[PDB]
């Protein structure tokens, strides 16, 4: 598996929003959807 749709990283949640609670690296190529912006269940 060499293709990745963003749709698996929106679907994975970063273990810098999970440990850290926010993903400084999000404005790198850190890959996974670091959304802090709308808090939601
Ligand atoms: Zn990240």
Do not use: L, Q, V
């Amino acid at each position: 598996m060499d293709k990745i749709n963003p749709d698996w990283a929106k679907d994975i949640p970063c273990r810098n929003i999970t440990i850290y609670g926010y993903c400084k690296k999000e404005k790198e190529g850190c890959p996974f959807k670091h959304s802090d912006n709308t808090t939601a269940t």
